[PDB]
Design a binder for this molecule. Structure first.
Ligand SMILES: CC1(C)C=C(CSS(C)(=O)=O)C(C)(C)N1O
Ligand SMILES: [Zn+2]
Ligand SMILES: [Zn+2]
Length: 525
């Protein structure tokens, strides 16, 4: 670079896109509006003599039925048009076989990076560790890192000869390699690890904060995050804002001279970090999260509702609409499949699933027990994302109930472990995502103790073995649930939640909702 010259570099970033190539039903986000917003920033920055780098934190896959059944092709092709420069591989990039991810690398005109994923038998990386970019006369290196929880979280069949090494140890080696060979002026890490307040990861694998602390001071200009699905806006030192408002200022986190940013999810925001480079120094001038046609739900006293833009409308780029429309129609044609029927509504509403036992909880858990041969089951009410109306059931309806690509697991445990496990789970309160939905369990919860506890209408025998079904999420500590993944009787089946529910509905159709009707088997006080 030129000695003493001040350079302008804008880093644009998104993460956890999760199939949101199209605007939602309220006209929010979508890649068409993202394209207009990004095009306008490129033009403004170019007129100032600056540079733009557009990065993704990964998890493009899974989350919208139209996208899922097309293996995120519209998302990857849309990202080429927005003009993404690099992407970190996320854990949801492993929801599909490795061959599908290879085809996503063919569709993407930008590299999909991960330095820490290795073939066990050969000791070779499966992906490119980093990519290099020339911006003005500056050399910028982008490193990709994936959470080492991936194999633990996903389908085990996909990881037999694959290992996810500790991303922080891998980042140290990659930084040192780059400093010794390519000598970039700027190093950025695009990651899919998550942001945890003060590095308090809990049951999750260590994330961004912990990694930034372990690295040499300021060795990375920034960590472009993802995974945790949070707008990284600090309320105080080592504390992110709870319930961040779109359009408000966003103070990103800084740990050991390294900025840590995240742009929430679903293309809702484009994060913008404006930096100035001079003589090796990188200084952040401004940081913002730009809403992408986000709308506030406004409810009048007469009960009438409307959705209103927080900021002025971003027009949808027509070239993006022409690219995406055929995939939106193809996605719909693929979703036009009747998988079964129900004689009644299956209650999946938030104000029900997080408060009381519902027939949708019983249906999902019946599907999970049937696939695993389980005696009983439990799941977080927060894992039930929609209802199924009376009548015909489409694959789309099933995907809306279970949209996250969770995996079905089971654990064989003693009656004593069953007693201890259900006692801790019964402590989860209503009005929370952690509120438990049970199947084949009955008790009267009183003073943190379970009375008349039964499995399949029978008292729990401590010596007896019982199989419980749940999701990978809960089994690994999700929502503060007791860990099952470290128990000897644990088995991760690899089966997706939506596929298990779909197939069970198919073979049990027509559903008689009376069979799934909760009758106060579990109660508190
Ligand atoms: C991950 C994969 C291939 C499996 C599924 C059923 S579970 C869906 C349709 C969500 N998907 O995109
Ligand atoms: Zn993730
Ligand atoms: Zn995610």
């Amino acid at each position: 670079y030129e000695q003493d010259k001040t350079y302008k570099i804008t880093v644009l970033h998104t993460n956890d896109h999760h199939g949101h190539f199209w605007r939602n039903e309220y006209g929010e986000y979508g890649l068409a509006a993202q394209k207009t917003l990004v095009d306008g920033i490129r033009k403004e920055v170019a007129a100032e003599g600056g540079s733009v780098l557009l990065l993704s934190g990964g998890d493009i896959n899974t989350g919208v039925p139209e996208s899922d059944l097309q293996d995120a092709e519209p998302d990857f092709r849309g990202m080429n048009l927005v003009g993404y420069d690099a992407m970190a591989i996320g854990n949801h990039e492993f929801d599909n076989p490795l061959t599908v991810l290879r085809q996503q690398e063919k569709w993407a005109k930008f590299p999909l990076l991960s330095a820490n994923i290795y073939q066990k038998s050969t000791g070779e990386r499966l992906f490119k560790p980093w990519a290099l970019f020339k911006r003005q006369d500056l050399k910028i290196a982008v490193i990709g890192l994936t959470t080492d929880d991936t194999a633990k979280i996903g389908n085990p069949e996909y990881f037999t000869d694959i290992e996810f090494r500790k991303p922080a140890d891998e980042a140290k080696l990659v930084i040192q390699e780059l400093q010794q060979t390519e000598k970039p002026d700027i190093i950025i890490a695009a990651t899919h690890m998550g942001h945890y307040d003060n590095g308090e990861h809990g049951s999750n694998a260590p994330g961004d904060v912990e990694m930034a602390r372990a690295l040499p001071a300021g060795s990375l200009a920034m960590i472009v995050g993802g995974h945790s699905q949070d707008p990284v806006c600090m309320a105080a030192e080592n504390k992110k804002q709870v319930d961040y408002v779109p359009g408000t200022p966003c103070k990103p986190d800084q740990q050991n001279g390294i900025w840590i940013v995240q742009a929430h999810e679903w293309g809702k925001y484009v994060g913008r970090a404006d930096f100035e480079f001079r003589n090796g120094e990188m200084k952040m001038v401004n940081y913002q999260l730009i809403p992408v046609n986000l709308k506030k739900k406004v409810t009048w006293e007469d009960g009438k509702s409307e959705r209103v833009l927080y900021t002025p409308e971003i027009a949808e780029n027509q070239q993006m609409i022409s690219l995406l429309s055929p995939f939106q129609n193809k996605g719909k044609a693929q979703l036009e499949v009747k998988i079964g029927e129900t004689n009644g509504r299956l209650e999946g509403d938030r104000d029900k699933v997080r408060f009381v036992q519902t027939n949708m909880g019983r249906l999902i858990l019946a599907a999970q027990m049937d696939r695993t041969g389980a005696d009983f089951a439990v799941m977080s009410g927060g894992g039930i994302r929609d209802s199924i109306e009376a009548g015909d059931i489409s694959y789309k309806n099933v995907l809306k109930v279970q949209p996250f690509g969770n995996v079905v697991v089971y654990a064989d445990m003693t009656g004593k472990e069953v007693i201890d496990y259900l006692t801790a789970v019964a402590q989860m309160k209503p009005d929370s995502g952690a509120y438990p939905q049970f199947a084949n369990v009955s008790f009267v919860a009183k003073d943190g103790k379970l009375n008349d506890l039964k499995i399949k209408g029978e008292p729990v025998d401590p010596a007896k073995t019982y199989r419980m079904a749940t999701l990978n999420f809960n089994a690994t500590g999700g929502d503060g649930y007791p860990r099952l993944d470290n128990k000897p009787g644990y088995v991760n089946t690899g089966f997706c939640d939506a596929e298990v529910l779909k197939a069970y509905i198919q073979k049990s159709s027509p559903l008689d909702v009376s069979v799934y009707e909760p009758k106060g088997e579990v109660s508190w006080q």
